[PDB]
Write a protein that binds this ligand. Structure first.
Ligand SMILES: CCCCCCCC(=O)O
Ligand SMILES: CCCCCCCC(=O)O
Ligand SMILES: [Fe+2]
Ligand SMILES: [Fe+2]
Ligand SMILES: [Fe+2]
Ligand SMILES: [Fe+2]
Ligand SMILES: [Mn+2]
Ligand SMILES: [Mn+2]
Lengths: 275, 275
């Protein structure tokens, strides 16, 4: 359907818009390139591990490669919905969001190639709870936006994508991987990549907060929706954590990683206010 | 609808894919930031112009600001269609394509703000032919892809977007603006911006060529479709040129700019081969 006119012909970009300012920060701070990371020591590290040590690392990497690929693809309906609503500055910011996710996908796939597991099908480490989130709930919530961009639909999409997938699971996964391999002195290239990724994801969560809060600001009714959609997904979040915990104990303070996930989930709720 | 699995979990990125290699070039060569351009001399230049000189520049700027805003918004259906087809490397490249267009929109809007015309509604310089392309045909061809990603629909979308809008009109517009103001010694900030934009658009046209050619390679039938869709839009291309020519003659070798447009249109055809 047609363009009515163009904001930068009728007027200008809204230079003070929060998402324009976030777009400006993303350009300044978004220069890293996964192609520049030296993975040669990660290759030696992985080869020195015993077979049992080798597969201990793979469930988390399997979870992150799919997470990053899913969020690369599944932000496109959000960008479409906000473009159709004329939210130009959100769209400009989301071009940096999408390109960040492309680099994140690339980083994990380069690591797999470098250490010699690119030919291994890591899907065996996606349990039913993981699939319910990443194969089903995430794409369903985002694709809804092509036919329903109501405030309820936008809140649900931002809740699943930004607050649960990125702000609870990915945030906790970064932390976990850092805890484990930083102390071991292992995989310096991957940890460099994760550091850059974590800096990017700081901006991404601000977009999710902005989006949910501006909708909640219209009607407190929507605060209770946000909380409900968070609680709806929790069983699958903790069900995936329980599965990773059960894998690792079979081959690290798990009670303290499990508590980081609970901490992050509750922190995301506190970043939205009923008013 | 669901994700079946994830390519970077089952395997890796296809490192030799042409669009992966273009993605890598885009990251290396895509560092410029419109926020770094010094427009202070452009402001003085524009203020020194007489009212009649001032409005001579505005029709082209009006055409470019809308062009860049339209192509920023209207690439999203192409990215969606290729993601749904599992073309991961195309999607990674298209994140750089979209972010490039965001910078292009930003650049022209910063220039308008800097020289003091941001408050002017420049839509008066969009004639019927311009509207037929940018307000109607472009968004219609791209949005089709949400419900019809047939090879015919993808060829038509790439033809309107990459070969006509970017490869014929934008290419000729860059050249024209360079010719005119480079020789005058005017608007050095805007010309710097246009130089960076032209470098970006070199990659964009390669994606359009790749996309059309891979579809033509399946069936020569589609070569004749490509030519037909190009010829269908020509009347609006030259009808906009005739209008800009008529404006400028009322306030520069026009016969030679008009011939650059014809040259570019025919050059784009020669970049697709029936086999
Ligand atoms: C064991 C606690 C860590 C859970 C977060 C894992 C998220 C992911 O791997 O994508
Ligand atoms: C006068 C010949 C130049 C025609 C190309 C203009 C395209 C544009 O302004 O977007
Ligand atoms: Fe993210
Ligand atoms: Fe379970
Ligand atoms: Fe372009
Ligand atoms: Fe006409
Ligand atoms: Mn990410
Ligand atoms: Mn452009």
């Amino acid at each position: 359907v047609h363009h009515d006119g163009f904001q930068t012909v009728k007027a200008t970009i809204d230079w003070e818009h929060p998402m324009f300012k976030l777009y400006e920060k993303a350009k300044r701070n978004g220069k890293w390139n996964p192609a520049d990371i030296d993975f040669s020591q990660d290759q030696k590290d992985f080869a020195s591990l015993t077979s049992e040590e080798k597969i201990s690392a793979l469930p988390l990497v399997a979870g992150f490669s799919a997470l990053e690929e899913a969020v690369t693809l599944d932000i496109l309906p959000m960008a479409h919905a906000l473009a159709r609503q004329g939210r130009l500055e959100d769209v400009l910011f989301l071009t940096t969001f999408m390109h960040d996710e492309a680099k994140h996908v690339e980083m994990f796939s380069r690591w797999q190639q470098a250490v010699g597991i690119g030919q291994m099908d890591l899907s065996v480490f996606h349990n039913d709870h993981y699939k319910r989130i990443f194969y089903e709930a995430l794409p369903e919530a985002m694709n809804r936006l092509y036919a329903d961009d109501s405030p309820e639909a936008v809140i649900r999409a931002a809740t699943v994508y930004n607050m649960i997938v990125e702000g609870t699971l990915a945030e906790s996964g970064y932390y976990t991987f850092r805890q484990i391999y930083k102390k071991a002195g292992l995989f310096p290239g991957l940890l460099q990549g994760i550091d850059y990724l974590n800096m990017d994801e700081g901006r991404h969560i601000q977009f999710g907060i902005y989006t949910i809060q501006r909708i909640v600001n219209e009607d407190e009714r929507y605060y209770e929706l946000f909380i409900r959609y968070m609680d709806e997904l929790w069983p699958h979040v903790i069900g995936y954590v329980d599965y990773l915990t059960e894998l690792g104990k079979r081959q690290i303070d798990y009670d303290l990683l499990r508590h980081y996930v609970i901490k992050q989930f509750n922190l995301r709720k506190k970043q939205i206010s009923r008013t």
